[PDB]
Amino acid sequence: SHMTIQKVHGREVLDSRGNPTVEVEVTTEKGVFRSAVPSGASTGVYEACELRDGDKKRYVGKGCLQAVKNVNEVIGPALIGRDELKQEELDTLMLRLDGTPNKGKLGANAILGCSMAISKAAAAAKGVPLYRYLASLAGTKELRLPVPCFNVINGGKHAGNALPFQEFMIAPVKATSFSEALRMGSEVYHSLRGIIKKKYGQDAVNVGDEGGFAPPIKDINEPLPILMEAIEEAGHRGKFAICMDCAASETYDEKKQQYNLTFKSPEPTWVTAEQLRETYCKWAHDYPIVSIEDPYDQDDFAGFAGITEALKGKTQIVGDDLTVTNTERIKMAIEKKACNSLLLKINQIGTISEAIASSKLCMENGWSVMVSHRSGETEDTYIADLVVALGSGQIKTGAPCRGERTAKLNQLLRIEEELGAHAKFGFPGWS
Amino acid sequence: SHMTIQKVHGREVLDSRGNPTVEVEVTTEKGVFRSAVPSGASTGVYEACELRDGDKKRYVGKGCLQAVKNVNEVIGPALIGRDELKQEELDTLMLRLDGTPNKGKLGANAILGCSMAISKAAAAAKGVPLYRYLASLAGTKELRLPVPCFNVINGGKHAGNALPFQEFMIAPVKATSFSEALRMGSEVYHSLRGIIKKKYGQDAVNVGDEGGFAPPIKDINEPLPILMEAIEEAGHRGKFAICMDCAASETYDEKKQQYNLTFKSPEPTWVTAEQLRETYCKWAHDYPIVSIEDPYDQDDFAGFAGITEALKGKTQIVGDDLTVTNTERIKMAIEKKACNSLLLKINQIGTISEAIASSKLCMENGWSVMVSHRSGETEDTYIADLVVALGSGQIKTGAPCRGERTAKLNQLLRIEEELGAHAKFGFPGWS
Ligand SMILES: [Zn+2]
Ligand SMILES: [Zn+2]
Ligand SMILES: [Zn+2]
Ligand SMILES: [Zn+2]
Ligand SMILES: [Zn+2]
Ligand SMILES: [Zn+2]
Fold first, then answer.
1. Interchain contact A14–B (C-beta under 8 A)
2. Is B431 helix (H, G, I), strand (E, B) or coil?
């Protein structure tokens, strides 16, 4: 009993947009283990419940006092005296404490902080770093440092501009270490600022939620030549690929069954799913686009399947809102061959055990796994250890700008250093 | 010897702009103690040396490999086996290891990471939190949570726009706890986004380096009514004051002896120091401006003195580039009655012992002390403990936005919680 959970305490803290979120400390004899919960803006309809207070007098209703109370008064007292090494057991206990399919009673934001902190307490109990401990939980045979996929032109709900599609990313796929990958990413980002400033002017180089540039662009094609120019100017021709996140659900009108390419503007530009496939095929041909995430609405399984088959072997199709890190949605995606990459978001599902199960299910069926931040992030670095632990080779955790993004990139540097020069880097299919 | 410094290791990590900086780990039997060094953009000419590599092939010359080497090969080996509790002794050793007045041999960025990490190792050795340990080093009689001064409209070298002056801040001076202060700050920030979007459009609400809005404003007066509107709209009329950082050295032309209010634009707007004093007096009258930082060039001691005397008792005048956290410059400022507040930047001077000495010298001569971030920040939270430890009641560490800013605000929440409901909040002169 001396080695068990001694204290569990939740508190409301701010995320990188200044919105409240939940952080949890688990205390054991080995110390205080702290994990914070991120928060999406373009949240899928099938995501586990993010519980907010709705008190118009605090943060216009975005308080997390109820989720914090649920940690302090409900979940915490159940965990005291328990063996933190029993990850599946404690995650299952919290699932049953909640008793609902969507974590709508306690909140996925109450449960996840606990799940995360338990795993860190356990890693400390074993006397191994978090990535090592999580690797054992996941049965991972080979750790690797991931290629970082840097969202450097921000759009959608994340900026700032007319641009309807959410994320335009660069990934140093030909780097041979994480150190080099991160430096190359930063150098291109710096070149990109100069290019954007020259083309669009001073007022164009302020940043979006994920640290990417938020230039005054409307056209979804327009960022792509700019990315290639920055890659070239920084001295890294040939070393980079492009990744997209369309977040296409956010533009979609269910009644009209079409996508609004100008939803942040006074007048609409209605576009069909077929008009989109033509665009995606053109993108994949004109540029080294190796990954397109959420190219269609979150329930367009047929659209997803069509593009997955069309770009088979050239461009992975990533489910994010389609799959919501959830084995049930993933099984539907597998059955329909809807996509071949999982965007893994721990807070889409709400426990470490379930997120791990989702990764394993995806990899067993031949998919890649891209571990992911949310657009509302914290100083928390859990996903850096998690992506190494899963050996997936792919992470997106922001542009190389803003501390809630660079904290993850830096933690990856520290892990790289621990593992030494024989540690694998990158995603083999892209190298 | 079992309790002494066991390992010292430096590494290059990224700051919140994606530029390299230095982080240092000190290892003792009590664990691994990690501190990272921030970096200014509008750096005073009298600041201690930030040592960069100048290798055009890495980060266009901004690498910190040499400072990191100096930690690993020079400073680290000197500290092994030493008693980390001896802060003044170890800081003085590092000063002498460098042997230059500006830390230009080893780098202030090599030395400071060591100074910081030593103090954290020592706090752990004493078994007290960092703020408690630092309070003892400084002889502080009363801890307090500071009023946060939130830079919510970003200008100068930190954005993004025509705006020549650097920082327009809001400070919840009438809050009665840090919790409330931070929530109020965030609520106003949120209201401000809506106001800026309505007045200037979508493209105006992207953020600068410190998480403030970077609207397309040229006129230095123009942000002030917008700040009052946001305060009112958020429901906090009467609770807030304004703080300014003109960073006026950045606009100053030495030969012309005038300030360029449009230095980021094709054509110049030349303005005299007398034209500035009229503006400052008008500001202080029209708005609750309680603090103006660097209203003049970093060597205009006479200008500083004139405005300090004119706003005596109404608006504190803060030396930043004037004083550079440096007892020699501070003595000149005291002699000339040039200012009455110190902006305290640990990396302007480069050791904890010297930064503490600067705080003590300032307070003994009746000045306030505003502990400060740099515009290039990290996930490091040292200044949160430091401002509590000094009991100064004033911090500026960003808008409530971007993780390198919110990490500090959150650490302040944690400290507040530890200290309990009888803990003092705020700056008495403003409450
Ligand atoms: Zn024990
Ligand atoms: Zn989304
Ligand atoms: Zn997505
Ligand atoms: Zn011992
Ligand atoms: Zn400055
Ligand atoms: Zn300043």
1. yes
2. coil
Task: List, in order, residues 6 or more apart from A134 with CB less than 8 Å away.
Answer: A119, A123, A352, A356, A385, A386, A389, A390
Fill in the DSSP letter of residue A248: G
**Which pairing describes strands B147-148 and A147-148: parallel, antiparallel, or unpaired?**
unpaired
B10: nearest Cα among B44, B36, B46 = B36
Q: Which amino acid belongs to residue A3?
A: M
* CB neighbour burial string for B235-260, b if at least 16 within 10 angstroms, e if fewer: ebeebbbbbbbbbbbbbbeeeeebbb
Instruction: Report whether B114 contacts B38 (CB < 8 A).
Output: no
How many angstroms does the Cα of residue A81 sit away from the middle of ligand 1? 13
Whose tokens are 């461009």? That residue is A315
Cα of B134 from ligand 5 centre, angstroms:
25
Q: Give dist(CA A401, CA A404) in Å, integer.
A: 8
Report d(CA B108, CA B44) in Å as an integer. Answer: 14
* Rounded distance between C-alpha atoms, residue B325 and residue B48, angstroms: 10
Exposure letters A91-118 (e unless 16+ CB within 10 A, then b): bebbbebbeeeebeebbbbbbbbbbbbb
**Cβ neighbours of residue A269 closer than 8 Å, sequence gap 6 or more:** A260, A261, A262
Distance from CA of B205 to the nearest CA of A (A): 6
| Interatomic CA distance for residues A255 and A237, integer angstroms | 44
> What does the alpha-carbon distance between residue A366 and residue A293 come to, in Å, rounded to a whole number?
17
Q: For residues A132 and A407, what is the distance between their CA atoms, to the nearest angstrom?
A: 19
Pairing outcome for strands B144-145 and A150-154: unpaired
Q: How many CB atoms lie within 10 A of CB A286?
A: 12
Identify which of A319, A287, A315, A350 has the alpha carbon closest to the alpha carbon of residue A114: A350
Residue B54 CA to residue B69 CA, distance in Å, equals: 15
Domains and CATH numbers, chain A: 4-127 (3.30.390.10), 128-429 (3.20.20.120)
Cβ within 8 Å of residue B314, ≥6 positions away: B284, B290
Please state, in angstroms and rounded to a whole number, the distance separating the CA atoms of residues B56 and B78.
31
The torsion of the CA quartet B353, B148, B166, B390, rounded to 10 degrees, works out to -10
**Residue A264 and residue A245: Cα distance in Å, rounded?**
17
Q: Ligand 4 centre from B27 Cα, in Å?
A: 13
Q: Catalytic residue positions of B?
A: 210, 345
Contact A46, A347 (CB under 8 A): no
A149 by DSSP, 3-state: which? Answer: coil
- ∠ CA(A410), CA(A374), CA(A31), 5° rounding? 55
The verdict on B400 touching A (C-beta cutoff 8 Å) is yes
Q: Which residues of B touch A160 (CB under 8 A)?
A: 202-203, 205-206
Quick check: helix, strand or coil at residue B201?
Answer: coil
Structure determination method: X-ray
End-to-end Cα separation, chain B, in angstroms: 48
The first and second tokens of residue B18, run together, are 């994606």
Q: Report d(CA A282, CA A256) in Å as an integer.
A: 25
Q: Are B20 and B63 in contact (CB under 8 A)?
A: yes
Using the Cβ of A378 and the Cβ atoms of chain B, whether some distance falls under 8 Å is answered with: yes
